[PDB]
Design an enzyme around this catalytic site. Structure first.
Site, PDB file in Angstrom:
ATOM      1  N   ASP A 115       0.894  -1.114  -0.148  1.00 39.37           N
ATOM      2  CA  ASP A 115      -0.074   0.185   0.062  1.00 39.37           C
ATOM      3  C   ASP A 115       0.967   1.300  -0.119  1.00 39.37           C
ATOM      4  OD1 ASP A 115       0.564  -1.493   2.524  1.00 39.37           O
ATOM      5  OD2 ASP A 115      -0.084   0.189   3.554  1.00 39.37           O
ATOM      6  N   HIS A 151       0.445   9.403  -1.731  1.00 38.99           N
ATOM      7  CA  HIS A 151       0.978   9.654  -0.309  1.00 38.99           C
ATOM      8  C   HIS A 151       2.335   8.957  -0.057  1.00 38.99           C
ATOM      9  CE1 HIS A 151       1.642  11.208   3.733  1.00 38.99           C
ATOM     10  NE2 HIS A 151       0.701  10.758   4.183  1.00 38.99           N
ATOM     11  N   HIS A 290      -3.592  38.595  -6.559  1.00 31.49           N
ATOM     12  CA  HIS A 290      -3.635  38.064  -7.982  1.00 31.49           C
ATOM     13  C   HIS A 290      -2.988  36.806  -8.166  1.00 31.49           C
ATOM     14  CE1 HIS A 290      -6.926  41.053  -7.828  1.00 31.49           C
ATOM     15  NE2 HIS A 290      -6.087  41.896  -8.641  1.00 31.49           N
ATOM     16  N   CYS A 611      -2.268  42.034  17.642  1.00 28.71           N
ATOM     17  CA  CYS A 611      -2.760  41.102  16.351  1.00 28.71           C
ATOM     18  C   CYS A 611      -2.120  39.869  17.097  1.00 28.71           C
ATOM     19  CB  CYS A 611      -1.852  41.065  15.239  1.00 28.71           C
ATOM     20  SG  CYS A 611      -0.172  41.284  15.073  1.00 28.71           S
TER      21      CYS A 611
HETATM   22 CA   LIG Z   1       1.283   0.254   5.286  1.00 28.71          CA
END
Ligand SMILES: [Ca+2]
Ligand SMILES: *[C@@H]1O[C@H](CO)[C@@H](O[C@@H]2O[C@H](CO)[C@@H](O[C@@H]3O[C@H](CO[C@H]4O[C@H](CO)[C@@H](O)[C@H](O)[C@@H]4O)[C@@H](O)[C@H](O[C@H]4O[C@H](CO)[C@@H](O)[C@H](O)[C@@H]4O)[C@@H]3O)[C@H](O)[C@H]2NC(C)=O)[C@H](O)[C@H]1NC(C)=O
Ligand SMILES: *[C@@H]1O[C@H](CO)[C@@H](O[C@@H]2O[C@H](CO)[C@@H](O[C@@H]3O[C@H](CO[C@H]4O[C@H](CO)[C@@H](O)[C@H](O)[C@@H]4O)[C@@H](O)[C@H](O[C@H]4O[C@H](CO)[C@@H](O)[C@H](O)[C@@H]4O)[C@@H]3O)[C@H](O)[C@H]2NC(C)=O)[C@H](O)[C@H]1NC(C)=O
Ligand SMILES: [Zn+2]
Ligand SMILES: [Zn+2]
Lengths: 630, 239
Positions: A115, A151, A290, A611
């Site tokens: 994975d 990822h 912008h 602030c």
């Molecule tokens: Ca894993």
């Protein structure tokens, strides 16, 4: 039940503007320039991964948008057809560390790190569980907005285009109700750094909606007198924030009336927007770079098949005035900061500047000003209206250039006697008022303008001049406007960097305050630093000073409106205040956004209104607030 | 509204070889029915659509009225002026075998003084049957607090003013395309904001006031026939 999705990291050439370079993301069976190499998520229909499903034009580079409801298992199969390795990390749902998709020291089996990073040519099933506690909490909407993304190298995976939407929903995903009457759309406000993607690892920062820049992005249509539900994802690999407005429209996130919509990387919102106006409206980011523009995208609405109010009268005038931000009370020095900014220097205007501002008057004569109260400093008059009230704004321009008065947060404004804009003008907020002339405006407060039972009793909003948004604001034209529901000293604070280098009058001040008006260098970057007055209400450095009675239980309408591009994190040195039904002690404000915090004065020193963002503080942005009894 | 010769006209009055140049001005995006309005629905081919589309490049009063639809017995001839009769008069106003005659129960518009609708404002003989006179100069607003009180769901809506939304909200209650055909129920109250704009008013070349009217619209035909009608003037600024 179970849900099968087939994805596949597909490399494509993308120019950020033509929805026709999407067709290349289809599949077998068997200029003008810019064009970048990217990689995205495409659906498929088989496991053979030879059937694409077409990219809807409005999604852009967005991934296929996986949905499952609570208790559903989700089976997803990557296939890495891109040049580089990818992954499939879900936010919002349960995994097992082999259907996770990020690699670290997790002390797991080498197949539990498949994975984590799949390789080109390869493929990988994933199994996500929607557990009972993955779902709406009742007080959330019927679906929650989340995201998958590759990822393996987050900076590259995001900037290359590996992100798509993911909606965990209650039970009754399939319930059906309003066939494309109530439109859902996915809005991916994202900054793709085409220079920090797997491609060419001097390049550019694209500020996109769903991967389109400049008002591209087809397809954002909505059925007239109905709602549209946005599923919102922010994205970037640097910090950055975005204020996301929709012309003519307010949002509804949580059960609040958001007007701003304030986003940063991996903000996940579900905002609702009721449409009551045919036409086109601009969805865009209001940050004054912008560079934060380019996040613009049209939104068409069309029509599909199947205790008694008050009227407030105001005589406001744009009139010019010597104004100093250190009102001849700030004792200087000679080192720097409050001496470079203030203190009439040889190449420094110092602290007195010619401004224009809104001013109250008592009658149409404009031959007697009105009360003041110096706490609400440079501000124009305070404008109030409960839901159902009308505001009559008789506005005289007593200054040089053309100016304007337009509300932000009132939707139903038109001239007083006719609904017909004048001359060749397409919208009032573009329609300038020449020096000397009066114009009569009618501001009509409707219900969708104001508080939602779940947010304050008064939404804090501003008005100002729009013949030149940026420079008119610089010049000094800004005022508070409250929009309440159905009593106080009042208390309005406005953090406003006043970029005097944009002030229409800089040319006058240059002549009237430098001893070398002849020889002035208009680009000495500290000379122009000497003209950014980091101002609270009117005044930089502790020139502002609030006197509240000890125990006087207040109400503070605060706003951040000015040359700013960064969010202002804001505090009261001694206190906590009550925000959105809880207490906090920092109040974060994006540019052009106001909030109402309810405060009770009870411990009793002299503190500091300021602030939080240090390098603003050291350039002035500080009030005083002394409390004591009485 | 149509502008012809130099007058704000609501309908075009036409008939065989009538010739006009009318101009109209389009403020609302959308689709609007152009159509002949004669009661005889045969007059009902004269119906065409017009689509309007984006292309490329002293102080005004607010008048408040509490008005009730409510039923009454209406007399068409309450004044003893009978004798004259070798001429029709009998037929329309006599009782017997199959004549109601002259006293029909109808529903009217009736002005009251406050939200309570327990007391009536000033009636006036001469305007009989027609609901309260609703004045409003260009710029003004009329708050028509409406309460029903009848035996069918009625409604009140002005032909003449473009800008007629609900009060407070700008959005309509249900799957309601239009406030005009949305009904009012049991004795519910609705609160409407009619705003008289310039493009509703006269045009220098026509009179200080120009004559309009309101009525229930849930079923224009039979509502007006039941007697839901009343006058609305629309006028200009500075017995
Ligand atoms: Ca894993
Ligand atoms: C959406 O709309 C915005 C706003 O209009 C565009 O943002 C513009 O971005 C471009 C650069 O990407 C700028 O405008 C153009 O810039 C080019 C020059 O700037 C770069 O050019 C070289 C290219 O090798 C770079 O190395 C260099 O560092 C600069 O960064 C020009 O190609 C354009 O043509 C002009 O140049 C000369 C004038 O002397 C002539 O040949 C032409 O007459 C022409 O004037 C142009 O200048 C600019 O930064 C942005 N514009 C504005 C108004 O701010 C987005 O690019 C656009 N999205 C698209 C197109 O997908
Ligand atoms: C535009 O508008 C509407 C659609 O919204 C349509 O109007 C009606 O259309 C229907 C048919 O779809 C018509 O119904 C039938 O009309 C037949 C023709 O007779 C007409 O012509 C004479 C001419 O003087 C008229 O006087 C007469 O009233 C009719 O209108 C009739 O033969 C039919 O009669 C029925 O009853 C008799 C009596 O028992 C039976 O013997 C017949 O078999 C039949 O069942 C029927 O009435 C209807 O008349 C139309 N209405 C009007 C007002 O004309 C339009 O057709 C549509 N399209 C156009 C105009 O092109
Ligand atoms: Zn931005
Ligand atoms: Zn006809």
């Amino acid at each position: 039940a179970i849900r099968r999705y087939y994805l596949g990291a597909v490399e494509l050439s993308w120019d950020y503007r033509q929805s026709e370079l999407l067709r290349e993301l289809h599949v077998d069976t068997r200029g003008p320039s810019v064009l970048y190499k990217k990689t995205v998520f495409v659906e498929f229909t088989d496991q053979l991964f030879s059937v694409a499903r077409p990219r809807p034009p409005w999604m852009g580079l967005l991934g296929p948008t996986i949905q499952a409801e609570v208790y559903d298992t989700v089976v997803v199969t990557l296939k890495n057809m891109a040049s580089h390795p990818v992954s499939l990390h879900a936010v919002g749902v349960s995994f097992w560390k082999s259907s996770e998709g990020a690699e670290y020291e997790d002390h797991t089996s080498q197949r539990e790190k498949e994975d984590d990073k799949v390789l080109p040519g390869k493929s990988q099933t994933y199994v996500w569980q929607v557990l009972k506690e993955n779902g709406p909490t009742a007080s959330d909407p019927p679906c929650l907005t989340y995201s998958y993304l590759s990822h393996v190298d987050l900076v590259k995976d995001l900037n290359s285009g590996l992100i798509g939407a993911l909606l965990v929903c209650r039970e009754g995903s399939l319930t059906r109700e309003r066939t494309q009457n109530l439109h859902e759309f996915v809005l991916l406000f994202a900054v793709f750094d085409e220079g920090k993607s797997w491609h060419s690892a001097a390049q550019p920062a694209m500020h996109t909606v769903n991967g389109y820049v400049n008002r591209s992005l087809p397809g954002l249509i909505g059925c007239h007198k109905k709602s549209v539900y946005w599923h919102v994802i922010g994205m970037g690999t640097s910090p950055e924030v975005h204020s996301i407005f929709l012309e003519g429209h307010t949002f509804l996130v949580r059960h609040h009336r958001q007007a701003s919509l304030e986003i940063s990387p991996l903000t996940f919102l579900t905002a609702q927007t009721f449409l009551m106006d045919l036409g086109q409206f601009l969805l865009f980011c209001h940050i004054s770079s912008h560079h934060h523009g380019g996040m613009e995208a049209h939104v068409r609405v069309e029509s599909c098949a199947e205790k008694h109010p008050k009227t407030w009268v105001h005589y406001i005038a744009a009139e010019e005035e010597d104004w100093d931000y250190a009102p001849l009370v700030l004792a200087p020095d000679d080192r720097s900061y409050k001496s470079q900014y203030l203190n009439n220097g040889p190449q420094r205007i110092g602290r007195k500047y010619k401004k224009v501002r809104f001013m109250a008057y008592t009658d149409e004569t404009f031959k007697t000003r009105e009360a003041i109260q110096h706490e609400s400093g440079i501000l124009g008059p305070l404008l109030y209206g409960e839901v159902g009230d009308t505001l009559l704004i008789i506005f005289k321009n007593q200054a040089s250039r053309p100016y304007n008065i337009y509300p932000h947060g009132i939707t139903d404004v038109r001239p007083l006697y006719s609904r017909r804009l004048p001359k060749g003008v397409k919208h009032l907020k573009d329609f300038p008022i020449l020096p000397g002339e009066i114009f009569k405006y009618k501001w009509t407060v409707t219900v969708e303008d104001g508080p939602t039972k779940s947010d304050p009793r008064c939404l804090t909003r501003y008005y100002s001049s729009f013949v030149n948004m940026e420079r008119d604001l610089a010049s000094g034209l800004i005022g508070p406007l409250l929009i309440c529901y159905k009593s106080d000293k009042r208390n309005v604070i406005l953090f406003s960097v006043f970029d005097e280098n944009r002030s229409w009058y800089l040319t006058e001040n240059i002549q009237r305050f430098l001893p070398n008006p002849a020889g002035v260098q208009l680009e000495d970057p500290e000379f122009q630093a000497s003209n950014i007055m980091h101002s609270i209400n009117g005044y930089v450095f502790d020139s502002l000073q609030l006197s509240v009675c000890l125990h006087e239980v207040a109400y503070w309408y605060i706003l951040s409106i000015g040359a700013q591009t960064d969010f202002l994190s804001v505090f009261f040195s001694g206190y906590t205040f009550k925000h959105k039904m809880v207490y906090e002690d920092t109040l974060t404000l994006f540019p052009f956004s106001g909030e109402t915090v309810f405060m009770s004065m009870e411990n009793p020193g002299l503190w500091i209104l300021g602030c939080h963002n240090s390098d603003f503080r050291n350039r002035g942005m500080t009030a005083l607030l002394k409390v004591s009894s009485c | 509204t149509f502008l012809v010769r130099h007058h704000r006209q609501a309908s075009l009055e036409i008939s065989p070889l009538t010739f006009l140049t009318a101009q109209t001005f389009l403020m609302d995006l959308g689709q609007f029915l152009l159509f002949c309005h004669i009661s005889s629905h045969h007059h009902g081919g004269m119906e065409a659509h017009v689509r309007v589309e984006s292309c490329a490049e002293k102080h005004p009063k607010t008048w408040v009225h509490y008005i009730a639809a409510e039923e009454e017995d209406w007399d068409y001839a309450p004044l003893v002026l009978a004798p004259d009769d070798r001429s029709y008069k009998s037929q329309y106003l006599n009782n017997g075998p199959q004549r109601i005659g002259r006293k029909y129960k109808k529903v009217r518009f009736m002005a009251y003084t406050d939200e309570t609708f327990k007391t009536r404002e000033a009636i006036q003989h001469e305007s009989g049957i027609l609901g309260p006179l609703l004045y409003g100069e260009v710029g003004d607003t009329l708050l028509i607090i409406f309460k029903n009180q009848a035996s069918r769901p009625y409604n009140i809506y002005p032909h003449g003013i473009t800008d007629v939304r609900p009060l407070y909200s700008r959005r309509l209650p249900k799957g309601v395309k239009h406030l005009k055909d949305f009904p009012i129920l049991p004795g519910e109250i609705f609160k409407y904001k009619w705003t008289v704009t310039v493009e509703d008013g006269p045009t220098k070349s026509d009179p200080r006031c120009l004559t309009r009217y309101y009525s229930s619209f849930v079923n224009m035909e039979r509502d007006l026939a039941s007697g839901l009608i009343g006058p609305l003037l629309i006028c200009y600024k500075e017995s």
